Symmetry: C3
């Protein structure tokens, strides 16, 4: 249970670092 | 405490999937 | 480690809010 939520939070972190990168491509 | 932290991340995950779909639109889908 | 994990999700939540403001600014704009 503990590990699962740590795994989840790390995965959301990476998904978020992915969106910030996609967001960078549109900006000049 | 645990149940609150779980619902928080579940809601942030939902908010992220919506931001993902916005990037799928701009990409020109 | 509640303190360490709650720190992580708070920073995650703010980065998500920041990005949500930016997509909102795009529609207006
Ligand atoms: Cl975004
Ligand atoms: Hg989390
Ligand atoms: Na930018
Ligand atoms: Zn974006
Ligand atoms: Zn707590
Ligand atoms: Zn430990």
């Amino acid at each position: 249970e503990w590990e699962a939520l740590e795994k989840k939070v790390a995965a959301l972190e990476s998904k978020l670092q992915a969106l910030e990168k996609k967001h960078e491509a549109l900006e000049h």
